[PDB]
Enzyme design. Structure first.
Site, short mmCIF file in Angstrom:
data_model
loop_
_atom_site.label_atom_id
_atom_site.label_comp_id
_atom_site.label_asym_id
_atom_site.label_seq_id
_atom_site.Cartn_x
_atom_site.Cartn_y
_atom_site.Cartn_z
N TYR A 253 0.85 -1.38 -0.13
CA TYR A 253 -0.03 -0.14 0.03
C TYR A 253 0.73 1.51 0.06
O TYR A 253 0.20 2.28 -0.54
CB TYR A 253 -1.05 0.07 1.00
CG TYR A 253 -2.12 -0.72 0.85
CD1 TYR A 253 -1.95 -2.49 1.01
CD2 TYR A 253 -3.30 -0.60 0.14
CE1 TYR A 253 -3.20 -3.03 0.90
CE2 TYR A 253 -4.23 -1.30 -0.30
CZ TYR A 253 -4.19 -2.78 0.09
OH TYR A 253 -5.43 -3.60 -0.22
N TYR B 43 -1.84 22.07 3.20
CA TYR B 43 -2.24 22.62 4.45
C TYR B 43 -1.14 23.27 5.12
O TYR B 43 0.01 23.35 4.58
CB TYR B 43 -3.11 21.67 5.13
CG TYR B 43 -2.30 20.35 5.31
CD1 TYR B 43 -1.26 20.14 6.28
CD2 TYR B 43 -2.42 19.15 4.36
CE1 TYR B 43 -0.54 19.23 6.36
CE2 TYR B 43 -1.70 18.11 4.41
CZ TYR B 43 -0.66 18.01 5.72
OH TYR B 43 -0.09 16.86 5.60
N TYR C 6 -7.64 9.13 3.03
CA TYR C 6 -7.82 9.82 1.68
C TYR C 6 -9.00 9.23 1.12
O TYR C 6 -9.99 10.37 0.38
CB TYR C 6 -6.88 9.81 0.69
CG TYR C 6 -5.60 10.65 1.22
CD1 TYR C 6 -5.58 11.35 2.32
CD2 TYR C 6 -4.36 10.37 0.31
CE1 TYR C 6 -4.31 12.09 2.80
CE2 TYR C 6 -3.03 11.28 0.70
CZ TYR C 6 -3.29 11.95 1.71
OH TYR C 6 -1.94 12.65 2.00
N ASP D 9 -2.66 12.65 7.41
CA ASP D 9 -1.08 12.64 7.19
C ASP D 9 -0.38 12.36 8.42
O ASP D 9 0.83 11.75 8.59
CB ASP D 9 -0.64 13.89 6.55
CG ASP D 9 -1.14 13.81 5.08
OD1 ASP D 9 -1.56 12.62 4.57
OD2 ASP D 9 -0.85 14.77 4.13
N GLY E 10 2.34 4.15 -1.33
CA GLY E 10 2.70 4.70 -2.72
C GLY E 10 1.94 4.44 -3.58
O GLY E 10 1.25 5.36 -4.32
N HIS F 117 -3.94 4.80 5.69
CA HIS F 117 -3.72 6.12 5.02
C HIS F 117 -4.69 6.09 3.81
O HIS F 117 -5.32 7.20 3.52
CB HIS F 117 -2.26 6.42 4.73
CG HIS F 117 -2.16 7.85 4.47
ND1 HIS F 117 -1.64 8.17 3.30
CD2 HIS F 117 -2.12 9.04 5.18
CE1 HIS F 117 -1.19 9.39 3.31
NE2 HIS F 117 -1.71 10.01 4.41
N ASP F 118 -4.37 5.28 2.92
CA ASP F 118 -5.11 5.17 1.85
C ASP F 118 -6.66 5.18 1.78
O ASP F 118 -7.38 5.58 1.15
CB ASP F 118 -4.62 3.97 0.68
CG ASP F 118 -3.29 4.10 0.39
OD1 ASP F 118 -2.54 5.15 0.47
OD2 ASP F 118 -2.78 2.92 -0.35
N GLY G 146 -1.05 1.91 -3.54
CA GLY G 146 -2.31 1.69 -3.32
C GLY G 146 -2.99 0.32 -3.70
O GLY G 146 -2.79 -0.45 -3.17
C1 LIG Z 1 -8.69 4.82 -2.09
O1 LIG Z 1 -7.59 5.94 -1.99
C2 LIG Z 1 -7.43 7.16 -2.55
C3 LIG Z 1 -8.63 7.71 -3.30
C4 LIG Z 1 -9.01 9.01 -3.97
C5 LIG Z 1 -7.64 9.81 -3.94
C6 LIG Z 1 -6.58 8.83 -3.68
C7 LIG Z 1 -6.36 7.80 -2.80
C8 LIG Z 1 -5.39 10.11 -3.99
C9 LIG Z 1 -3.68 9.80 -3.62
C10 LIG Z 1 -3.20 8.66 -4.27
O2 LIG Z 1 -3.68 7.40 -3.98
O3 LIG Z 1 -2.29 8.64 -5.04
C11 LIG Z 1 -5.94 11.16 -4.71
C12 LIG Z 1 -5.39 12.43 -5.17
N1 LIG Z 1 -7.37 10.88 -4.67
C13 LIG Z 1 -8.14 11.92 -5.27
O4 LIG Z 1 -7.75 12.84 -5.32
C14 LIG Z 1 -9.79 11.54 -5.67
C15 LIG Z 1 -10.37 12.52 -6.27
C16 LIG Z 1 -11.44 12.24 -7.04
C17 LIG Z 1 -11.99 10.93 -6.97
CL1 LIG Z 1 -13.63 10.74 -7.44
C18 LIG Z 1 -11.44 9.96 -6.19
C19 LIG Z 1 -10.42 10.15 -5.52
C1 LIG Z 2 1.30 10.16 -4.77
S1 LIG Z 2 2.02 9.25 -6.06
O1 LIG Z 2 1.70 9.82 -7.41
O2 LIG Z 2 1.44 7.85 -6.05
N1 LIG Z 2 3.63 9.02 -5.81
C2 LIG Z 2 4.41 9.65 -4.92
C3 LIG Z 2 4.10 8.95 -3.68
C4 LIG Z 2 4.56 9.53 -2.28
C5 LIG Z 2 5.41 10.83 -2.53
N2 LIG Z 2 5.82 11.10 -1.16
O3 LIG Z 2 6.57 12.22 -1.00
O4 LIG Z 2 5.33 10.31 0.09
C6 LIG Z 2 5.37 11.43 -3.61
C7 LIG Z 2 5.11 10.98 -4.80
O5 LIG Z 2 5.15 11.51 -6.18
C8 LIG Z 2 6.28 12.53 -6.23
C9 LIG Z 2 7.47 12.25 -7.11
C10 LIG Z 2 8.53 13.05 -7.48
C11 LIG Z 2 8.45 14.33 -6.64
C12 LIG Z 2 7.52 14.81 -5.84
C13 LIG Z 2 6.37 13.85 -5.50
#
Ligand SMILES: COc1ccc2c(c1)c(CC(=O)O)c(C)n2C(=O)c1ccc(Cl)cc1
Ligand SMILES: CS(=O)(=O)Nc1ccc([N+](=O)[O-])cc1Oc1ccccc1
Length: 121
Positions: A27, A64, A51, A89, A29, A47-48, A31
């Site tokens: 999970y 934030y 969000y 977070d 990074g 965490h996942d 998910g």
């Molecule tokens: C199950 O876990 C989730 C769910 C939603 C999420 C993320 C992770 C992450 C982060 C990530 O997992 O990379 C982002 C950025 N999410 C969204 O913005 C988002 C926006 C619109 C919809 Cl309809 C649904 C989700």
């Molecule tokens: C959220 S993501 O698209 O799944 N990848 C990602 C995951 C974790 C982090 N982080 O800083 O914990 C940072 C991440 O992405 C970056 C890669 C390079 C520079 C900044 C952020």
């Protein structure tokens, strides 16, 4: 944003979010799916999961602000998407801190196929 989380992660564990945590277990990074391999992996799962309760927020890009009251992480008043994100977070940060002692490197860059099974948040 990932900026504030990453920083929160480093202060807390002394390890850099990328790459100590961007690819860990099932999970951290990515998910997707599977059974969390271990405590840190569970921290990412929950965490996942966190969000997931904010469908209309943008965790990765909404910034934030927080402060440390002697070591405590204190989220500051912002939009409500911002507040609820910040709490999600802080938990992860704490959680990671709480299990650094079992953070294992055999989970770094874990291959996807080893992640299967169901988990509902
Ligand atoms: C199950 O876990 C989730 C769910 C939603 C999420 C993320 C992770 C992450 C982060 C990530 O997992 O990379 C982002 C950025 N999410 C969204 O913005 C988002 C926006 C619109 C919809 Cl309809 C649904 C989700
Ligand atoms: C959220 S993501 O698209 O799944 N990848 C990602 C995951 C974790 C982090 N982080 O800083 O914990 C940072 C991440 O992405 C970056 C890669 C390079 C520079 C900044 C952020």
């Amino acid at each position: 944003s990932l900026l504030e989380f990453g920083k929160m992660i480093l202060e807390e564990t002394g390890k850099l979010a990328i790459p100590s945590y961007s690819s860990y277990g099932c999970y951290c990074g990515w998910g997707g799916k599977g059974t969390p391999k271990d405590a840190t992996d569970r921290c990412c799962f929950v965490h996942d999961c966190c969000y997931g309760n904010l469908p209309d927020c943008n965790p990765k890009s909404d910034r934030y602000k927080y402060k440390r009251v002697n070591g405590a992480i204190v989220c500051e008043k912002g939009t409500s998407c911002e507040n609820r994100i910040c709490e999600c977070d802080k938990a992860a940060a704490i959680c990671f801190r709480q299990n650094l002692n079992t953070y294992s490197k055999k989970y770094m860059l874990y291959p996807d196929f080893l992640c299967k099974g169901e988990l509902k948040c």
